[PDB]
Ligand binder design. Structure first.
Ligand code: YT3
Ligand code: YT3
Ligand code: YT3
Ligand code: YT3
Ligand code: YT3
Ligand code: YT3
Ligand code: YT3
Ligand code: YT3
Ligand code: ZN
Ligand code: ZN
Lengths: 48, 256, 320, 38
């Protein structure tokens, strides 16, 4: 969801943890919060 | 075939190990998506690179080409795969920390068994083991190439907008989650499909090159338009099969 | 449990044990069907802690990437059916000798021309591995292989890793304790954690001098001992020759080793003889890694363009 | 001169592929800014 410079060596990569906690809201906005939110909230897929 | 080892046609996928033990084609697709889901979730919690996640997602997709979902549950393999991917992508997390994060995601209410309990020390073993099994099943082929790489590179070469380039990378990640493209097409091609897809959502048209070649001809040689529309179609088919929620909360409100 | 891509080691017949390591460490073998001689290295797992040693995963990941003439070649990775434990084996193309043994044997002889090729092959291997952003980190005679046909190979990437071409941003924090004591560069002995290619090149120099001395030129017993020897040979480590070397937390520990004059060429004079040879060993054994010559420029040093030019290694390998 | 002109909006359409991807995720210009941190 957040592009990264391919040129960057692996260990130089940035964490995948979004910058803001994930809410309990299910709106257009929160549905695109991060990958996890998009997958679970927008599409409705879950591992539990 | 060593370069073709982990690539399968539609028919070949038509028959997987899982299928062998009576698992419906769709049933398997979900186990896959779900595994991606848990992998991404555990990944963000351990805060590893999205590179690590992508890698584990593939280790997982290839893994279930040999082993069955029946004998190895996604919720068991996922934590092992990620734990491995983390070492491969040079952002290693301690075994404990992964175990904890997994427990948290799979057992929200319960509490982390004492780091001395047999219940705990047991899974430390199970994980280490599933690890070596994962290694042996992938035939130690650890280096993975993802579409993301080619997506970024291309969006830059076509002066793609900021968010268009972002949407593009966003699809590349969805292709690893929602589809099996990583078992059917090479990254470069996937990347083209991801971009083609975004431009379709954003009405962005990439003009032909000042040398006459189409944009994708700068990503991979084998790609054609026909291919793009066909694969974009399948990706939509997959998207339309998820119990897609948005369609209902799609407009009403925002928040704070 | 299918394992279509991890053949069982059985396919190989253990012909003998290579060197005196552990019970089932390194083994010479023959493919029961092609008779192919291969070297079997077991992934030792006493580091039974965090699962499959990351350090191993690296070796393998790296070995499968580096495909160059002067780099040992990894054939496949075999296993041994497990039960109460499981083991993993790396199958390498078997290599006849190691530079350590050849130089050990008071019998083997090298012509300046022959040394020149050993060296040119070593540096060519390094240049390749380094151009693929890979640090060997375990340079030493014992890991420099030579085939029956006289081809050099860099071996044991068990301590190897990737490195970043980051002239750009943030400094890198790589593992400090690496490289056997006797072949360890000063930068590391001072605690450096932002090193790069130059560490392998310092080994390349310790090795090159060995071709003439027939034994490790600096054999410390402790890290401080090592530093002392290095000082006695390359000269005292001071900010004069090493811009900003003061900042090393560990430097403030060299206080008593401060008067040595660079005796490099002098101490190796009696052994090397050839001028250009004394020169490249001098440029490789440079204290400040930033001033230390690299693989590329070493490959263009006069020592590689002056009579006697490089000749194969048949002579040295003279039937045995 | 650059190798590629800049991407241009082609919103005059009868494109099933686009309609489809739209009905799934919503209008791009609306959602677009929520995607990700930046
Ligand atoms: Y279809
Ligand atoms: Y070693
Ligand atoms: Y002082
Ligand atoms: Y140079
Ligand atoms: Y513009
Ligand atoms: Y925007
Ligand atoms: Y944005
Ligand atoms: Y924005
Ligand atoms: Zn909301
Ligand atoms: Zn979220």
């Amino acid at each position: 969801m957040e592009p990264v410079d391919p040129r960057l060596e692996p260990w130089k990569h940035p964490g995948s943890q979004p910058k803001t906690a994930c809410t309990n809201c299910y709106c257009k906005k929160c549905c695109f919060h991060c990958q996890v939110c998009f997958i679970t909230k927008a599409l409705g897929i879950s591992y539990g | 075939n060593n370069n073709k080892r982990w690539y399968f046609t539609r028919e070949q996928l038509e028959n997987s190990p899982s299928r062998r033990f009576g698992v419906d084609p769709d049933k398997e697709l979900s186990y896959r998506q779900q595994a991606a889901n848990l992998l991404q979730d555990m990944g963000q919690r351990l805060n590893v690179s999205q590179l690590t996640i992508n890698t584990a997602i593939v280790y997982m997709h290839r893994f279930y080409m040999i082993q069955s979902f029946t004998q190895f549950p996604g919720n068991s393999v996922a934590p092992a795969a990620l734990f491995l991917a983390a070492k491969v992508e040079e952002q290693p997390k301690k075994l404990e920390h992964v175990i904890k994060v997994a427990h948290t995601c799979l057992h929200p209410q319960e509490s982390l068994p004492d780091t001395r309990s047999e219940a705990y020390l047991q899974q430390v073993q199970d994980l280490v083991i599933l690890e070596s099994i994962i290694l042996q099943t992938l035939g130690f082929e650890l280096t993975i190439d993802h579409p993301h790489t080619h997506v970024v590179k291309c969006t830059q070469l076509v002066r793609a907008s900021k968010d268009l380039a972002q949407t593009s990378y966003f699809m590349a990640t969805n292709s690893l989650h929602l589809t099996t493209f990583s078992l059917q097409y090479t990254p470069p091609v996937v990347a083209c499909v991801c971009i083609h897809l975004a431009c379709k959502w954003s009405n962005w048209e990439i003009p032909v090159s000042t040398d006459g070649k189409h944009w994708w001809e700068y990503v991979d040689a084998t790609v054609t338009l026909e291919l793009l529309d066909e694969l974009t179609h399948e990706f939509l088919q997959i998207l339309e099969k998820t119990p897609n929620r948005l369609k209902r909360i799609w407009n009403w409100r925002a928040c704070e | 449990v299918e394992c279509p891509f991890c053949d069982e080691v059985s396919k190989y017949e253990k012909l003998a044990k290579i060197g005196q390591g552990t019970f089932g460490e390194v083994f010479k073998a023959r493919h029961r069907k092609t008779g192919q001689k291969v070297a079997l290295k077991k992934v030792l797992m006493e580091n039974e802690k965090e699962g499959f040693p990351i350090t191993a995963l690296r070796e393998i990941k790296i070995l499968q990437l580096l495909k160059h003439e002067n780099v040992v070649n990894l054939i496949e990775i075999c296993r041994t059916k497990a039960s109460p434990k499981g083991s993993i084996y790396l199958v390498f193309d078997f290599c006849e000798h190691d530079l350590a043994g050849l130089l050990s044997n008071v019998l083997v002889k090298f012509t300046l021309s022959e040394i020149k090729r050993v060296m040119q092959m070593l540096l060519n291997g390094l240049y390749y591995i380094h151009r693929n952003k890979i640090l060997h980190r375990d340079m030493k005679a014992a890991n420099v292989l030579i085939t029956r046909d006289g081809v050099l190979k860099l071996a044991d990437f068990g301590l190897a890793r990737a490195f970043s071409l980051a002239k750009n941003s943030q400094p890198n924090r790589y593992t400090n304790r690496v490289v056997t004591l006797w072949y360890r560069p000063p930068e590391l002995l001072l605690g450096e954690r932002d090193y790069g290619p130059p560490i392998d090149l310092w080994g390349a120099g310790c090795i090159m001098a060995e071709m003439w001395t027939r034994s490790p030129i600096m054999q410390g017993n402790t890290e401080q001992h090592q530093l002392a020897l290095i000082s006695q040979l390359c000269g005292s480590i001071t900010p004069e020759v090493w811009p900003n070397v003061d900042n090393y937390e560990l430097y403030e520990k060299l206080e008593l080793v401060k008067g040595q004059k660079r005796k490099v060429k002098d101490r190796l004079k009696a052994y090397v003889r050839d001028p250009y040879a004394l020169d490249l060993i001098d440029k490789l054994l440079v204290l400040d890694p930033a001033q230390r010559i690299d693989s590329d420029d070493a490959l263009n040093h006069d020592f590689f363009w002056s009579d006697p030019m490089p000749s194969d290694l048949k002579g040295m390998l003279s039937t045995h | 001169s650059p190798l590629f002109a800049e991407p241009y909006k082609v919103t005059s359409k009868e494109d099933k592929l686009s309609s489809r991807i739209q009905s799934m995720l919503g209008n791009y210009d609306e959602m677009k800014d929520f995607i990700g941190d930046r």
